[PDB]
């Protein structure tokens, strides 16, 4: 094995042991998604109220 990068302090210590070597959308686009879904809710509710009006 091999122990590398030994760092010590009062509260503890850390090290690394090696055994073998190797071999975003914008706010505008987000707002469009949120309002598109709200538009589909309004359309679905308007059709319900239309159905109830008949």
């Amino acid at each position: 094995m091999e122990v590398i990068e030994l760092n010590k302090c009062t509260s503890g210590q850390s090290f690394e042991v090696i055994l073998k070597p190797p071999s975003d959308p914008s706010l505008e686009e987000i707002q469009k998604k949120l309002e598109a879904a709200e538009e589909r809710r309004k359309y679905q509710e308007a059709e319900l109220l239309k159905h109830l009006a008949e």
Binding site: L48, L49, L52
Partner: protein
């Protein structure tokens, strides 16, 4: 505060609704005058779901009593807990509905519906967070069936984003008032298919059979039938009236129980049904709860498949043993649960048992076998409609035969829709 607004319409709707408020007022420690006299804070923790708090720390049921004649509502006001209801919430006419869906829906009920909605609006305006509505009614009469569904339609228009929940009593020739009940029930079922989120199918056929075969009551009355309804209504609302994680409100219940919007008709079950001092074990609760003889819909669950199941255990018992027995029933009879909805059985436990029992269990099933109920109504409908028998009671109120034909087709489609998922 997630409030529910309760509405009871017609003779059956008010008689079972009155007993429901008597049963749950006793569970929450409310007396016939509205004063609280319990000994557990669990009684008051979710009290505002069904009760408004008035002056002097009085608890007033958030209930609205509707009928087209004053007879049954006068009996309620004269009943034990009659004084607890808000007097303004008594909305009644004088003509009646003659067991006629058209009178309740189109003529006599149309004259009274707006004043009912004024009271619904008054109750809803003070709600900090309204869940939705709870309607008790029968489908075989005229007021509860015809005016009840008119109310459901006008409430949905004014509150489209609220849950609509009903307790709907299905007619049976075993407990029949008039021959036109299949007409009234068929017209009402299509309304429920479109305008409710959850409907508990309470079959007077099943209530009669339970009273006769099981409870050994040779001559069952409506009081005997309504005792089964009271205990069932208490059980299915336990998760709404006490603190808990599962199905604690009307919408979360709907999301767990309704995989397809039109298939929202539930088979309720209850255990025990004793004709009384013997201790009932958790295994016995589970076996009886799932037994067809304890179902309130007169459908054989082994003739269909369970889409979703909600189970509620009440009393001081081992939740470990409850989990084991619930898993036992699923793993024992996994052929009766659809394999394309994983973990579709949910279990809740409440520490407070109902009155008179140390332990109880309530079953809420969305089974495709409920098509047997709708087939039965459909066959009784068609036997008369093919001869246009008794139609003049309805055409005399403005209805056309086409509206009956459309109602016939609507319920046959519902039957076909249940059958498609029973073989999928």
């Amino acid at each position: 505060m997630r409030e529910i607004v309760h509405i009871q319409a017609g003779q059956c709707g008010n008689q079972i609704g009155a007993k429901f408020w008597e049963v749950i007022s006793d569970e929450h420690g409310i007396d016939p005058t509205g004063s609280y006299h319990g000994d557990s804070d669990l009684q008051l923790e979710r009290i505002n779901v069904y009760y408004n708090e008035a002056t002097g720390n009085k608890y007033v049921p958030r209930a609205i009593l509707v009928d087209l004649e004053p007879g049954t509502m006068d009996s309620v006001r004269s009943g034990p807990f009659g004084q607890i209801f808000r007097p303004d919430n008594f909305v009644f006419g004088q003509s009646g509905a003659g067991n006629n869906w058209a009178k309740g829906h189109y003529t006599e009920g149309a004259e009274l519906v707006d004043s009912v909605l004024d009271v619904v609006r008054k109750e809803s305006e003070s709600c900090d967070c309204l869940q939705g509505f709870q309607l008790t009614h029968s489908l075989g009469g005229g007021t509860g069936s015809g005016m009840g569904t008119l109310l459901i339609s006008k409430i949905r228009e004014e509150y489209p984003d609220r849950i609509m929940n009903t307790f709907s009593v299905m007619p049976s020739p075993k407990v029949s008032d008039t021959v036109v009940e299949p007409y009234n029930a068929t017209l009402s079922v299509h309304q429920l298919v479109e305008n409710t989120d959850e409907t508990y199918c309470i079959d007077n056929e099943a209530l009669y059979d339970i009273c006769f075969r099981t409870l050994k009551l040779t001559t069952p009355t409506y009081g005997d039938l309504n005792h089964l309804v009271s205990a069932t209504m208490s059980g299915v609302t336990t998760c709404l009236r006490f603190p808990g994680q599962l199905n604690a409100d009307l919408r979360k219940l709907a999301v767990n129980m309704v995989p397809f919007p039109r298939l929202h008709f539930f088979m309720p079950g209850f255990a025990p049904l004793t004709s009384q001092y013997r201790a009932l074990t958790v295994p016995e609760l589970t076996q009886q709860m799932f037994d067809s003889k304890n179902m309130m819909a007169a459908c054989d669950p082994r003739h269909g498949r369970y889409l979703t199941v909600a189970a509620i255990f009440r009393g001081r018992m081992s939740m470990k043993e409850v989990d084991e027995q619930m898993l036992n029933v699923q793993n024992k009879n996994s052929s009766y649960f659809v394999e394309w909805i994983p973990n579709n059985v949910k279990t809740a436990v409440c520490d407070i048992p109902p009155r008179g029992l140390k332990m109880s269990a309530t079953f809420i099933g969305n089974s495709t076998a409920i098509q047997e109920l709708f087939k039965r109504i459909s066959e009784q409908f068609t036997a008369m409609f093919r001869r246009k028998a008794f139609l003049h009671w309805y055409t005399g109120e403005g209805m056309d035969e086409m509206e009956f034909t459309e109602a016939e087709s609507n319920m046959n489609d519902l039957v076909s829709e249940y059958q498609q998922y029973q073989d999928a």
